[PDB]
From a paper:
Several gram-negative bacteria employ type III secretion systems (T3SS) to inject effector proteins into eukaryotic host cells directly from the bacterial cytoplasm.
Crystallization of this complex required the reductive methylation of primary amines. The resolution was considerably poorer, with the protein adopting a loose packing in space group I4122 with a solvent content of 64.3%. The overall fold is identical to that of the shorter construct and the structures align well with r.m.s.d. values of 2.033 Å between YscX32:YscY and chain A and B of YscX50:YscY or 1.388 Å with chain C and D of the latter. Moreover, the C-terminus in this model is fully resolved and is helical albeit with high B-factors for the last residues. We found that the N-terminal 31 residues of YscX are prone to proteolysis, indicating that they may not exhibit a tertiary structure.
Numbering used by the authors:
A (entry chain B): 47 to 122
B (entry chain A): 10 to 119
The structure:
Amino acid sequence: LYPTAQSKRSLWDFASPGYTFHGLHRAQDYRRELDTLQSLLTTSQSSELQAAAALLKCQQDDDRLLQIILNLLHKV
Amino acid sequence: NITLTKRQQEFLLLNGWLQLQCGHAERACILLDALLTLNPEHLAGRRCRLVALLNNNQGERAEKEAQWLISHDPLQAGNWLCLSRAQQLNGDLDKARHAYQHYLELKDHN
């Protein structure tokens, strides 16, 4: 019935993809795939794809906002 | 007509997995549904989405996904834990006890 620390560890390990995104420069490669993928999925007519495209646009703009915050914490 | 590169499949997978770690199961499900709409055979994605559905309380979908994985990914204990949780979400408590007992037996693969 209820969960068990063993139950949730088996859940995590089950859901966890492990090492993924196989590349040499995680930061540039991430922003590049995010932008490419977000502009790619809007062109879908599928409701399921359209929702993903919207969420990606979101993190794309939350990253623009955090970039603004990060600049503010550089100067003192 | 849309096709995902390997890196792009990995990207969505990793975004779905990261949102699921944040406790954001709907966001996880949306990302993983898009992946599994275009690459239905992405097993890591099937698993991650299966657990995300179990946390966003989509028991009937979670069920169909768990039996799907059991029929396609075999001897895997986690499939049975997912079936148990999905079955308990659907109110079939006994179906969940049979599924949980199968889970215990293969966790016993040690």
